[PDB]
């Protein structure tokens, strides 16, 4: 019982500490939209590069 | 005591597991930094697309 | 013994709540990939801005 009382006090402290620093699902709720925007940027930059390359040849 | 011993044992395993699997507030800070970079990029790319369109018209 | 079982009961409830609300390392596993792509995008957009400025001047 002396052991079990100390262990519970340890767990209490451990739970409050990890609760303080744990990321929640709410915190990362935006992740899919962030990924989408990176994907959008990859495409738009690719197409911009192609257009700029064509323009660089036309201007000469 | 027989219950406590069993319950505390499982609780310790669960808490250890949570600590290992969890993402943290530091990861959230990093996500927010990335969001800020992406937002800047979206703005820059929009402006670039507008300039390129103007140049395409004027070169033609 | 009874008060310990009470505190353990509350703790089990707290842990179950945390387990359901937890975001995990596997969940954000794509974060480093996005970070790498974004660093490359920053570089590419820098170069695009430079080339567009040069073309604007020329035109």
Residue numbers in the entry:
A (entry chain A), B (entry chain B): 8 to 67
C (entry chain C): 8 to 66
What does the paper say about this structure?
α-Helical coiled coils are ubiquitous protein domains, found in a wide range of structural and functional contexts. The structure of coiled coils is understood at a level unrivaled by any other fold. They consist of at least two α-helices, wound into superhelical bundles and held together by a mostly hydrophobic core. The seven positions in a heptad are labeled a – g, where positions a and d are oriented towards the core of the bundle and are thus mostly hydrophobic. We find that they indeed break the α-helices to form short β-strands, which associate into a triangular supersecondary structure we name the β-layer. β-Layers are found, also repetitively, in natural coiled coils, where they form regular fibers with alternating α- and β-structure, a protein fold that has not been described so far.
From Thermosinus Tcar0761 we derived the constructs T9, with the full MATKDDIAN motif, and T6, with the shortened motif MATKDD. For T9, two structures were solved in alternative conformations. Surprisingly, the alternative T9 structure, T96, starts out in the same way, forming the β-layer with the first three residues of the insert, MAT, after a g/c position. Consequently, the middle three residues constitute positions e, f and g. It thereby shows the same 6-residue element as the structure T6. The last three residues of the insert are accommodated as a sharply localized stammer, before the C-terminal adaptor starts in position a (highlighted in pink in Figure 3A and D). Thus, the two structures T6 and T96 show that 6-residue elements are accommodated as N-terminally shortened 9-residue elements. We therefore thought that the central aspartate of the T9 insert might have been sufficiently unfavorable (T99) that an alternative, with the alanine of MAT at the center of the β-layer (T96), became observable, even though T99 allows the flanking coiled-coil segments to remain unperturbed and T96 requires their distortion.
